[model samples]
Target: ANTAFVSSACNTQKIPSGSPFNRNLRAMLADLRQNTAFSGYDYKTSRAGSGGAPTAYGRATCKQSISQSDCTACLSNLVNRIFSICNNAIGARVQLVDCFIQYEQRSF
Candidate 1:
């Protein structure tokens, strides 16, 4: 909803390009829209969140590491947990060792 998210998203899409890790992270971003409140130790690369998509929204970021591929893997793992464990709540959050991800209804 702010520059933090936009910049981080852009950074993922921009600076991390060409890396499979980043590509995975990009795919995760494409999966859903996001609203985030980042916390803990995420390093300088860490930011709050990226905006949501008009249809389906989602967002995520890695730990201190900036490897897009690893970031994407972390997101993918969390998403699987959401589907299997959380069953995909309207507003959901899953945190991994390498990343954090969340999704919610458009109204949210």
Candidate 2:
């Protein structure tokens, strides 16, 4: 058996538009307010009950002793290319210096 605990900050009270805090507060409110996109990504792994270890499949090729700017650029390009190739494949993922994409049928 399992249970859930949810909390909210601003259900009806108005938050001003021009306030800088509004953006931050709105993010917090969204976090607390409801289930979010990719919410299922946070679920416990389905493999947890299995008597086997989860495997990782990824390709990370960093140039030997690369500079920060070059590293970032390479990672960015890799991320974009990988995503384009693996479009809409659940459990697909790509990680880069400046960006990352992760999706899975079960937690990893």
Candidate 3:
């Protein structure tokens, strides 16, 4: 199967590394991989934080041909890929040959 990188985009705004939003975002990205690993398909989170108002929302999906384990790894690796490509943007989207993941600062 083709797993080459296609293309990606990021929001115009950059979030500082030490900000609360950034912390939540990193957690959300890690959460995406974990949840996708379990479900093996489409997965999303509206408010993945606790003890305060929600801070992050995102979605991840993989093509049917990809197995659960592969999808898990794909999203996990893409999390780093997005950070490197986007340079810590507040929002970003990346598409590989088999899967796609997107996250935003606000609701959907």
Candidate 4:
């Protein structure tokens, strides 16, 4: 039998638009991108802030069977989709055939 893979949707309340959350989220993403680059398993997790300020937690990973370049490409696509689909969302998860990306306001 043949199987298929499908991507999921982002279903969470939007973070307050143009707030500190947005700023922190952007910072988190930047760190996440670099993490993906240097990580051995093509996986990484990050938190936006320490305390007293809004925070975002994020994680991304690719299939271990895939090549490093493939992992990077898959995560690149996932990253773009996260921002495009979730935008102001406070939490979201997207799983593709080759990789997964998730982010939230709480610990993952």
- On lDDT, the candidate that comes out on top is 3
Question: Could you give candidate 2's per-residue lDDT for residues 1-108 as a string of tens digits?
Answer: 011112111112222334343233223323311222123212111211122323222222333345444444444454345434453232344444433334333334
Question: Model 1, 3-47: lDDT tens per residue?
Answer: 121111111122222323333333444453221113222211212
How are the candidates ranked when ordered by TM-score, highest leading? 3, 4, 1, 2
| Highest TM-score against the true fold, candidate | 3
| Per-residue lDDT value at 11 in model 2 | 19
Q: lDDT-based ranking, best first? A: 3, 4, 1, 2
What tens-digit string does per-residue lDDT give for candidate 4 at 1-94? Answer: 1112357667567866556677677677656655664586455465556435567788877677777677677766766777676665877877
Q: Given candidate 1, what's the lDDT at residue 38?
A: 34
TM-scores for candidates 1 onward, in order: 0.44, 0.30, 0.85, 0.74
Candidate 2, pairs of clashing residues: none
Candidate no. 2 TM-score: 0.30
State how far residue 23 of model 4 sits from its true place (Å): 2.3
lDDT of 2 at 36: 20
Q: What digit string (tens of lDDT, one per residue) describes model 3 on residues 1-108? A: 346799898898887656667667777777787887576588887545544434788899887787888888777778878888888888888898887899997877
Task: Score candidate 2 by lDDT.
Answer: 0.32
Per-model C-alpha RMSD = 13.7, 18.8, 2.5, 4.2
Candidate 4 lDDT at 21 equals 74
| Candidate 2 ranges with C-alpha deviation above 4 Å | 1-61, 93-107
Task: List candidate 3 stretches off by more than 4 Å.
Answer: 48-54
How does model 1 fare in lDDT?
0.39
Q: Give the Å error, residue 50, model 3.
A: 8.5
| Candidate 1 lDDT score at position 4 | 20
